[PDB]
Amino acid sequence: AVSKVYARSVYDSRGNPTVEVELTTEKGVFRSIVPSGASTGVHEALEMRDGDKSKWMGKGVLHAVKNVNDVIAPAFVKANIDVKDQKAVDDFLISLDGTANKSKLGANAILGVSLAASRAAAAEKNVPLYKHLADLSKSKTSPYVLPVPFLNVLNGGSHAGGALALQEFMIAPTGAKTFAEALRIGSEVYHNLKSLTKKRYGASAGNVGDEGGVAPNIQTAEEALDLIVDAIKAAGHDGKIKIGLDCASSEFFKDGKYDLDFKNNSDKSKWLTGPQLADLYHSLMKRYPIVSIEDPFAEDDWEAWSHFFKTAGIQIVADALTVTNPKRIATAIEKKAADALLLKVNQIGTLSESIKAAQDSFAAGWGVMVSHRSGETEDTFIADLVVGLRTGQIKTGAPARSERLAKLNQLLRIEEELGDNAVFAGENFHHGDKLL
Amino acid sequence: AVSKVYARSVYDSRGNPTVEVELTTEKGVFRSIVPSGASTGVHEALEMRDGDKSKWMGKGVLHAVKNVNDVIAPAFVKANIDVKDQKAVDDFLISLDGTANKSKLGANAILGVSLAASRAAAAEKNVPLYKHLADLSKSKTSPYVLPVPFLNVLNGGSHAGGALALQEFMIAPTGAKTFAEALRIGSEVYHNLKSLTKKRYGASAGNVGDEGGVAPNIQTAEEALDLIVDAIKAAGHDGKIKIGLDCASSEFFKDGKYDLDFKNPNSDKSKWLTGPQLADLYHSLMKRYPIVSIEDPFAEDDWEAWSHFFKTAGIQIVADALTVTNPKRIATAIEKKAADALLLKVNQIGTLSESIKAAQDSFAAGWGVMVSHRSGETEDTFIADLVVGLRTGQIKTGAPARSERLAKLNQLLRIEEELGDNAVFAGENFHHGDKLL
């Protein structure tokens, strides 16, 4: 049985506090750490911070930690829940908070308990976590699917200091035959990108943003994409590497329009309409091997999404639009706003709700890209999750900064363990769950 | 008994391959990952790289991985060594290689087995790793000592793109009462530093170097130190925060002179500094800023310059590239009175036992020891347990940003919690942490 639930404050990858949970059973101690976003969707479940300006500059999580130790822990232990029954674990937690957005206890109090229970369950079952997560999600397991990594090698927007408006420029080694090959050739592109960036924009441009990508002081998507295409050819991997974007356009949506110079005394006359921004993306799609675009329009700009999607012809990923929330996903499906869900467990707050979100997406013919947050930790949960969910695609950072490599390394280990019972999603990343 | 030893290629914090070792016993599977330096000393034990330009830019570790799987593993499993006997484990590995500088197998093949064995031994004894490391090093345990973290908040030299010659500018919250407080106030200074750096030098200057520190495109130590003092001020921690430097001066030493603009290929050779001129610079900084420690002030074989500076420095002087965690070179440094602290990097020498000897020799001479990360780190937390086990009272493991750095700092939070009243924070006594109480 679960004998102990304990929380403490630890530090995330940008130096902010976050919640770490330890769950003790007869099988040992199981730890989960809650990640933290910067460009959060306004519809995300509550991340509870202390707001005490004299400690951690208001970003303390002592209240959330207290909620685990003083509220969740005694009730959870008393309940004698079977950790194998994830739905019972999450129903209990959801009920204890009693609010839709988890505003009573905090999503960052609840999530760590939810995740740690799944680790405890995997141990009880003597299976690796990814096999247990496949069980919980009722995914196909013959074969397992290793994801294409979408590597965020050039950082802009909220994740890096500079003028660049679009948040993420990713490479996707869809042309590799194994995950290990994909990661190697991705790392090679990254290193070529680092050298080229220093050459073109100066030594300072080669330093990294929150997610490990280079952060050159550039003003347009075109020069960023030119750098990436240049890095791919320098590495000698043209045709094996595709490109993904996260526009994170909610970050520059104001008064019905889009400010591509929001990293500025920005010119209100230059602000773009939905149609104009769609024309911009189409122009980029024509000149670059772009296979996925995330949050091309704002989190509630439904008409703009639906209109773009009609003729996009590539994967359109909903992040802030859907916030890993089955209710908002249902709306996005009906409006035909996108065809892939960005899955972030801490946007909704429990594993069970995240699994439901993935299942609803798959049922609609959508893809699912499992995702890190920009404030990450040494935790590797999402590596096991992307495999368990059989999605065929993950974004977990550049191949730099170990809060990113921790996940990528874990996927190397998973690939090795599965051997002949796994296949790399490659060009079929979008429908990874349907593969075979 | 050890039933399996297995190695694989994984990625370090810079995106370069490195060696990960898993060692299996009755107690489970124990993992260690080898770190990788950038500003390496010429006297370091061999880091074996494949040099195949068509893979990983030539930086593959497949040869070292193969040395573990095809050479070390079958021999080690056959030997059936008691993992609790770290000295026997390491003597065995050192003997398998048979070379001074570990050039047969590579230090990056040997070290992973060395470290994972110690993890396995801790499990056998049912003790946390830091208690076992204290056993191996014969350190005092009443109380245990938590280190002052030297946080590298401004990155220059080899660790970041920019004109800044000096490699590391660190803050040391020696004025804190607990490790948790030290890390909190350190993080607060860091955040104030990031915001101020962006204000003074532009948004791009706030982006980070290899070790998580800001990398402003600045040319002089004085303005870097002004940024740090300004950040400490902004956070409201004046008096509680001290400063450490890593000059990594071997990186800019040429023709008996020091080039503080070495990353500029158009650097004027007339502006190059002599040993005494450099000593003057350091003394100028030490009077204007709360500097308590300086690492590698002079080049790795510029022995006379070290001895001369140390005679009147009056602060901690840390040997890194000079000593390369090597008992033989440490003995020379002790004799020459070149420094009074060792920077301890396990992968500079290649085994835990040799590293422990290096620390013991340093302590016996009345030196301090600062346990250190490499600039290419991993999610491995070994050094956190090592610094506590060795009772040194000081660690450098990066800025409070990038989780290859926070993983260690977070582990130190956990160790402090676990030890409760059986641990003290070194604080102002960081230099002689081993002698504390």
Ligand SMILES: O=C(O)[C@@H](CO)OP(=O)(O)O
């Ligand atoms: O926008 C995103 O997709 C995420 C992950 O890159 O960033 P953040 O965690 O800051 O929301």
Ligand SMILES: O=C(O)[C@@H](CO)OP(=O)(O)O
């Ligand atoms: O010089 C140093 O002290 C180390 C650690 O900061 O750097 P590197 O690992 O690059 O040698």
Ligand SMILES: [Mg+2]
């Ligand atoms: Mg976001």
Ligand SMILES: [Mg+2]
């Ligand atoms: Mg199963």
Ligand SMILES: [Mg+2]
């Ligand atoms: Mg149009």
Ligand SMILES: [Mg+2]
């Ligand atoms: Mg996004």
Ligand SMILES: [Mg+2]
């Ligand atoms: Mg719900």
Ligand SMILES: [Mg+2]
């Ligand atoms: Mg060095």
Ligand SMILES: [Mg+2]
């Ligand atoms: Mg003991």
Ligand SMILES: [Mg+2]
């Ligand atoms: Mg002088």
Ligand SMILES: [Mg+2]
């Ligand atoms: Mg050094």
Ligand SMILES: [Mg+2]
């Ligand atoms: Mg030796």
